[PDB]
């Protein structure tokens, strides 16, 4: 029996803090459920432990908002996709928009309007007379975003002019050149697919905040790690989580690859303030068995995915949530 | 003050559930809880027919023992009993529905004393080396006898309804299964004021399907 | 809420563990004895240490663009507390003259490798030769003119690169300058980060950078700084690694007169050369020492201004040193 | 079997800083466990003082886990063969924290003798008569053991000075040493004895951190089997 060594754990102890610097204003009934789990080994909590962190010991700050938000920096999530597809379970979340935002990236767009044909509001707001304005797009057509994602991921580079504009074969196509690594030099330590156009900034409805994506292959499995420089904890990233590991199952497929890991590392973490009382409820929310996610086995080519050849199986949920300004 | 059974005996349940059949008229926007998972057999077995991951779980926890934790569990029994002073091994507790839809090869259950409740069988019935009880009243009575780590009650659907009812369920190690599958039993609908969920696992995929472990625990009767 | 057999849960939840013998790699129970010795390793240094040994046991085995072979993992992340300490390893003796000079001439903007090879600087000796460029297929530059990287991505990202002696001045987007005016005047801002993985200029670059990007945080008069590394030489290059971007969070949140707090070090492709696991095998036997603390010349006030002899490394004390590139 | 510093859960507590040479080397200074041994100077602390190292001393000193004394008693009373030792000993555990004369002197009155613990000194030139009943005082090293037979308390701590760890080591009396390294170069008069590799190990490391300007960490060595 060793003892002994118990008493030593307390002494290196001897510096952490007391109950009056932890930061915020928490209420202990208000994880009651959340803090009486003795082993929360879900993967989600992968999810419900940054938030918890954020609100127990989060710095108070303002924002670009003035909403004013928790927050926190440097986390990294892990969820292993070949035993579960990370769709939370702890709140209701649809896939139809980022799905179709996702092909939307791989075609290489930029105009907001393909989306909103498809009832697909995410980058609405971002697309206004108002909002241009506000970045000083005087110039640019509503809903026309500028040099983001689809544009940096397949013409990197090349002069952006209009979302109409035919841009083929004008700057680095960034995706193809990851399928090729992936396919042909898959010891690669170079497998990056980029978004922060340090040059292209300005010109974007706003800088993006999936930064980048790097590959890692072994053994016929394909690993992704994401890098994402802003985090909205409470809207964002569940569903961020959801977009980067069907782009890990779509990319491992067309290479006959088999999905693993979707690392996902977060830079500003944050919560904002009027998110807080909902994600107070959502944290005591004891999570279901993941769902799976089934992809048509025939697409052979990142390009030739359509909404139909993608499909979640399973889905067990809780109640969707709004996450109010008001409530 | 005096303790019940469930406690004294060490007696737990460990099942599998999935989610059932029954024909939502609306797959679309359905409402989920606990519940969801009560899928437990279908014409005399299991809904899903096998499951690797969840067979094996089921094997680790019925099988494990920690020898150097029974003597605590001696006394307190002896004591219990106002007495005191082979491997040790656990009990499972199952029905006789259960033990015939046990393949033979599997029979009893290897390094575990095989319980099993039956009026219509004797121990004449039974080649094997297992106990024979016609009354959940029996088992207390043999539990005292028996030098064991603990009664794992294992199925089936009329086995689990009893014991609950009668509150001889200190645990329940249930095993969600993830996928649909056409069910004629079902496990019973817990209260939540008298379990509570103390532990979820990790996700995993094994047959087709994602599962996960959680542990409920008899609430501290007091809500 | 004490319970006794809750800790027979806790064997249950690890039914699925792993119990083969070839724990992977071929390593004897043995190599490790110290290392596993310790029963608290609290030591920050026990950070890096740790992933080695990660690495080491269930490393994956792989073959590399130079067919040296590695054992390699994806994605890690250590973070060091500046306010407290100077993460200089120390089970290893590490110099840090030549890694100054470097930051200081990717500050200063520069491209040409002559500028450090003059100083006795060597670190990218290797990649700026006749053959290392021919190789690169930048057959028409000159040895040494090491492209478009990191100095020329700082100072004038975007601008169209020549030769290592054109004049840039006020060409492309200077970086530098932006972060550390959104540090003094726009600190909540969730967009200060300093890029040098230009997609377009990557394969004008003698190589494509290592560190990807540095992102910062500013609360309470304090600035952190995130560092993706896309490859990471465990043995020897990570060491050197962890203390440049360290000294750098020292300089940029002195010129912006804050007080630097934590170096957040996320790894995307680490990896343990197969030359270097016998020296690792005795470095993670050795105990680490307290670590030094940086000192800067309190009179400089913008990052332009730094010169060799404003940094000073106090007490430092270290192990002996290993010399990596013998394999086995 | 049992020896005494296992069954009185005897262990040493000290704070080494850096000892400054004269003597600039012929080459790139070599650098061991031995390295930090720097105890005093003229009586005194040779760093004045350091916030951080005098909470950890107080927070070890002063620390006792109640529901585990009773294996340690059973422990120590079996061995004196004797059985046990309305007030056993103010109402409520602690340790023993034995010191020198000179350390004793340096502790400044407000201080003195240390809170929640049972003080003891060596002097061979002190006269108990003037110490109050708390405060012990002794005539040897082999007196300690006997009054650790008459006493309840948790563990004891030899806490200085250098003749008093001096001969405690060599004596085999101690168990652990909860050694704190002071990162930074002083004067010193008197040092810590060199701890033989072969006699101790290095069981834990902490954190590093940093106070009254100099960073400094914590280790604790393990009397090995040998
Ligand atoms: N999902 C899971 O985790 C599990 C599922 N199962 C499934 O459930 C099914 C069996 O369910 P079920 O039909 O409820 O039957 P059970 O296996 O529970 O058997 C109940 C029957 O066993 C005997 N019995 C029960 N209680 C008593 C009592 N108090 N005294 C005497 N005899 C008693 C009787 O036997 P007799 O008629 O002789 O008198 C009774 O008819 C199978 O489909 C099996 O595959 C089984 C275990 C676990
Ligand atoms: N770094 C650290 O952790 C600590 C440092 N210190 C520093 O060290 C200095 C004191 O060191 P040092 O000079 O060694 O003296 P000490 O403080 O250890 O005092 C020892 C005294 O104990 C007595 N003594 C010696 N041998 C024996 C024995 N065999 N049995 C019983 N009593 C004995 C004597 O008392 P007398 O002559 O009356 O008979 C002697 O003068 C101070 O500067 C103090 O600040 C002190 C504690 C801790
Ligand atoms: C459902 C199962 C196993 N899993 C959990 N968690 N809980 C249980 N109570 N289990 O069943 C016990 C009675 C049926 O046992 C078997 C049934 C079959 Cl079909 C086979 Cl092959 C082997 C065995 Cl041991
Ligand atoms: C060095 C110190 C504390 N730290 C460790 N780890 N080990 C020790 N043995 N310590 O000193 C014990 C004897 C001196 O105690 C004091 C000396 C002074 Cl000067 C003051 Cl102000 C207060 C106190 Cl309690
Ligand atoms: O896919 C996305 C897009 C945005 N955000 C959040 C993070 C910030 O709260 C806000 C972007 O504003 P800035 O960080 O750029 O200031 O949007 C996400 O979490 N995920
Ligand atoms: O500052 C540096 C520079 C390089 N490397 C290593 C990583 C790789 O081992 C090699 C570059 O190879 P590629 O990953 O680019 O292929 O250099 C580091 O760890 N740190």
């Avoid at chain 2, 004797?122 to 207390?140: A, G, S, T």
């Avoid at chain 2, 014991?163 to 649909?180: A, G, M, Q, V």
């Amino acid at each position: 029996d060793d003892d002994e060594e118990e008493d030593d754990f307390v002494y290196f102890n001897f510096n952490k803090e007391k109950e009056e610097k932890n930061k915020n204003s928490i209420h202990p009934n208000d994880f009651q459920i959340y803090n009486s789990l003795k082993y929360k080994y879900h993967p989600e909590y992968q999810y419900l432990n940054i938030i918890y962190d954020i609100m127990m010991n989060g710095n108070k700050q303002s924002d670009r908002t003035g909403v004013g938000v928790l927050s926190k920096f440097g986390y990294i999530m892990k969820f292993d996709l070949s035993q579960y597809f990370p769709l939370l379970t702890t709140k209701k979340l649809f896939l139809r928009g980022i799905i179709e935002e996702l092909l939307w990236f791989i075609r290489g767009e930029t105009n907001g309007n393909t989306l909103l044909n498809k009832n697909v509001r995410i980058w609405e707001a971002n697309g206004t007379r108002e909002f241009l304005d506000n970045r000083k797009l005087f110039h640019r057509e509503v809903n026309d975003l500028g040099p983001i994602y689809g544009f940096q991921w397949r013409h990197f580079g090349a002069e952006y002019t209009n979302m109409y504009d035919n841009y083929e074969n004008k700057g680095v196509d960034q995706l193809k050149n990851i399928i090729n690594l992936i396919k042909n030099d898959p010891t690669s330590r170079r497998i990056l697919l980029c978004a922060w156009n340090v040059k292209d900034l300005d010109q974007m409805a706003l800088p993006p905040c999936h930064i980048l994506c790097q590959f890692y292959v072994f053994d016929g499995k394909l690993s992704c790690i994401m890098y994402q420089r802003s985090c909205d904890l409470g809207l964002g990233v569940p569903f961020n989580i959801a977009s980067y590991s069907i782009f890990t199952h779509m990319i491992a497929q067309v290479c006959n690859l088999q999905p693993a890991q979707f690392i996902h590392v977060l830079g500003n973490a944050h919560v904002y303030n009027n998110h807080i009382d909902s994600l107070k409820i959502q944290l005591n929310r004891i999570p279901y068995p993941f769902p799976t996610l089934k992809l048509n086995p025939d697409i052979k080519n990142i390009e030739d995915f359509t909404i139909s050849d993608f499909t979640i199986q399973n889905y067990v949920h809780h109640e969707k949530i709004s996450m109010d300004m008001a409530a | 003050m005096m303790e019940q059974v469930c406690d004294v005996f060490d007696i737990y349940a460990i099942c599998a559930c999935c989610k059932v059949e029954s024909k939502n008229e609306g797959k679309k926007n359905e409402v989920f809880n606990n519940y969801t998972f009560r899928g437990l057999g279908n014409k005399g077995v299991l809904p899903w027919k096998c499951n690797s991951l969840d067979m094996k779980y089921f094997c680790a926890v019925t099988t494990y023992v920690n020898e150097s934790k029974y003597e605590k569990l001696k006394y307190k029994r002896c004591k219990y009993l106002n007495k005191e002073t082979k491997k040790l091994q656990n009990v499972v507790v199952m029905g006789r529905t259960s033990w015939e839809s046990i393949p033979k090869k599997f029979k009893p259950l290897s390094n575990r004393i095989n319980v099993i409740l039956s009026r219509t069988l004797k121990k004449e019935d039974f080649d094997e080396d297992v106990y024979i009880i016609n009354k959940v009243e029996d088992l207390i009575v043999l539990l005292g006898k028996l030098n064991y780590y603990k009664c794992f009650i294992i199925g089936g659907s009329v086995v689990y309804q009893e014991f609950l009812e009668k509150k001889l369920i200190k645990k329940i190690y249930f095993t969600r299964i993830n996928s649909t599958y056409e069910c004629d039993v079902f496990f019973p609908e817990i209260n939540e004021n008298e379990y509570q969920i103390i532990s979820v696992s990790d996700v995993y995929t094994s047959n087709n399907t994602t599962l996960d472990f959680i542990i409920y625990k008899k609430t501290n009767n007091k809500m």
